[PDB]
Symmetry: D2
Subunit: 270 residues, 4 copies
């Protein structure tokens, strides 16, 4: 089969940002939008189908669909608060398993939703992946970029729950990051921006969409990239309970990691 179909469950802000970016980057032959409001998914797909009709965009098949479209889907994107999200995962995941494929997790809480779909159903663990702290990484690379006027791509390292930057693994242009900069100030600037965008913009659809496209490009091109993604831990860094075409392959600072593990654990119990 010379076709690549990526399904996007949930056709809201983030949902339309992920599908539109998939069409802009041309990462799929057919894009299906699933959502309770079929009118929203159809309109978003129909409007996207017009964009794909441009002279520079490939003829990507955008159209409304159902869970049946997950059968031939190369990737399936899923777009007190923890329990409600888990209930949604039980419905979409219950249908995906009934029909089949890599599953990219976006719906929030991310760490919780990714855990629900990775333990409550009989799906290959490698095919389950959540954006995780990939967004915080993008933000971390942007904070230091605007601080010293340097390409964000220079900023290296990862950023826990989608919430701590591992300064030991970070480095710009090959050397450590370091008036004077404050390691706690950068962390404070991260949590504030995470609250300012949602408060001033109303949602975060562009960053999440780009982070999702990165994982899509990794799974589609089998790059074997080591990126901060969500995955049920199995003793990694004393905590328990590589992005490729076949899913996931292998994997003071330690205190913050365990602190986040205790935060998600409390959410898992609730």
């Amino acid at each position: 089969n010379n076709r690549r179909k990526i399904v996007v469950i949930g056709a809201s802000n983030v949902g339309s940002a992920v599908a539109n970016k998939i069409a802009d980057f041309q990462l799929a032959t057919e894009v299906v939008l699933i959502d309770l409001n079929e009118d929203k998914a159809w309109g978003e797909a129909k409007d996207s189908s017009h964009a794909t009709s441009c002279i520079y965009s490939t003829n990507i098949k955008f159209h409304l669909g159902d869970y049946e479209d997950c059968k031939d889907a190369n990737i399936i994107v899923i777009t007190k608060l923890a329990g409600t999200n888990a209930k949604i995962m039980s419905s979409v995941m219950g249908e995906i398993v009934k029909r089949t494929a890599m599953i990219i997790m976006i719906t929030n809480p991310l760490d919780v939703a990714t855990y629900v779909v990775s333990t409550q159903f009989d799906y290959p663990r490698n095919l389950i992946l959540g954006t995780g702290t990939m967004l915080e990484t993008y933000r971390f690379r942007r904070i230091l970029a605007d601080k010293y006027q340097v390409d964000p791509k220079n900023i290296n390292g990862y950023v826990g729950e989608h919430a701590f930057v591992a300064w030991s693994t970070t480095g710009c242009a090959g050397f450590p990051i370091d008036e004077k900069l404050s390691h706690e100030a950068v962390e404070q600037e991260l949590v504030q921006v995470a609250y300012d965008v949602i408060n001033k913009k109303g949602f975060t659809n562009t960053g999440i969409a780009m982070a999702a496209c990165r994982f899509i490009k990794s799974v589609l091109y089998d790059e074997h990239t080591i990126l901060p993604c969500s995955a049920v831990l199995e003793g990694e860094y004393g905590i328990k309970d590589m992005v490729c075409a076949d899913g996931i392959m292998r994997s003071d600072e330690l205190e913050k990691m365990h602190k986040a593990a205790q935060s998600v654990r409390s959410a898992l119990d609730g």
Copy 2:
């Protein structure tokens, strides 16, 4: 200067779409978001800056700026939208009044609706070079016309040649005389695929009007398709492609219509609209063109001007 700055007025659905499509396609070194709701413009800009930080996206400068950024801007995409003609006419008069007072060499890409009215307001009320003013116009309808026949016959929409001319709101008519699918008449597809259901030219035009009203209601807005059309015109001016595309602008006697903004084939180059291409319309198509000219002017006069 090795930089290309694109300012985008309006940070709403249509304004954030054209901004993110400009970043996905990498059509600007610095993208500036301007909107009365500065909080929305900053949030969309900051969120976009996080996307550009990806490993595959160039370091595009996304930030909340003021009209001062339009001073050295290469393109100014105005999308700040809302009787409908009068309200938008006042909005276009405010945004344009601030642009002329800072720059007069940037490219103006009209997207706000009514498209024909907005393009006519900023083009005749101010002393901005007319060539540097362009409107998406019925280019979005062209995409819809290409998609309608594409799904109807399972053919690449890009093979569907021609234009959809007229008004971008309701008076958008397809000029069947200038159309053609893959080097042969569009009406022949029924004979090629052996379809007993004859291709009704009227049905296709009506279907183009229903889909336009379905998306605006079902989806609640139209920001995806329109964002791509703006990128096409942005690519035409950034690459000096001299592409003859259907964009909206004040007519200067084409088809006998003057003092009215409509969508007709016009060459888009680095300097904007180079010239117009008066393609011979049929007696029925030309009648639709004049009908569309009276529709926009009936709305322009109703709002004053």
Copy 3:
């Protein structure tokens, strides 16, 4: 299913490395293998491209020297390997190994003579006819788009139509299917007010002179043909269902049979779904038949 896309490029010469590089630049496949008799050239061309794919802006596209066993899990197999009979022997030997390892890949012919090589790999083997394609006059179409573009400073993309016939010789412009920016190309002289009206026979000769000039001035033609190959790769990988001019064995189109020529054909994910026999005028029909006389003459000479 398979989330990977694998393209096979037989022959790692100028054109061979032009298609693999262009593919890598556009990112069309997950793994691209170069199969050439000169394994050193294929390894060198692949390795050099492997360094490019390692860029921060380029995906991790797998570049490596492979053999015909790689064609088993391949979605597309681009072939860039008296001249008509000699190449026919290369196609029979090359295609002889492709049919043994796979029967579902897309065969995109680029080797010259294009029409001869396309007919050899399409009739002398049991490969699915729909999965056999050749660039054909798609390259000549680009030249036609650029000639009218540079002559009137109009976007070549606006130049609609086709160049049909045999690739490299007997190629004619299908004026009955052409037209710039929705209007006839002949109307450009009236729009731009050109005293020296457009001579159709002048651009046809220029279409053949430009081909000989590049080969004599540049030494070869690998850039334009590489883009045409990527266009067809995009048509099959994105299931675009595009009606483009590609070479393939005719089965009654224009009364021409037993020869491969470039005519309007719809390219889908499964290759050529069907052909579109446009209404060629009396003069163009003779050019379509004259091209068949040259192709059949080459096949008979083999």
Copy 4:
């Protein structure tokens, strides 16, 4: 202002054509000019490229043969044209560039890279910031690929700038590169030099890797990314490749950030004295 970007490619040989074609594939310019003494081959390369840009998915990039007068409004001027004879070529082509322009970013690819970059940045009064040399940028692509093919990991993960592999500033996705052996340093360095010549003896030259390297620098200046990448240029303190910030205005500042570095400076200096 100017809404179009113009790039000039001096020398249309393998590397030159690879750079111009990739600039067209990535659409990093509105007009590409191929200047070369062999006007025939530059015209054909540009004419052949003009056909590729006539595609549906390719912007209308103006490809044509030009002269040094095109460098007047050229945004970037790449130079893809033992060490002495090449210095005469760099001095002749540069003397014509400075004679008509003074604001175009200059990228150097001619060999010797370190010598050719120093020849154009010393015998003329051109802004130093607007000079640049690919240098070891391609060597880094090799170091990333060798480690990528050695452990089947993304080459992008591999970090650090080869300048010799400057192991003191390298890393794989943020963790020690040696950890992959658990899931040497002098051996990959030998592979880093033997592979470069194996491609030259097997393929005949190296134009694909170096072409994207230039494009990597083209994207850095056309987008004002301020990316700190290893590029060859005039070395003051700390021509040779070192970590430098690349932006639209050229090289803004340098990043200092050892035995092999001094040996390379002595070799480049010895070649400059002989020229």
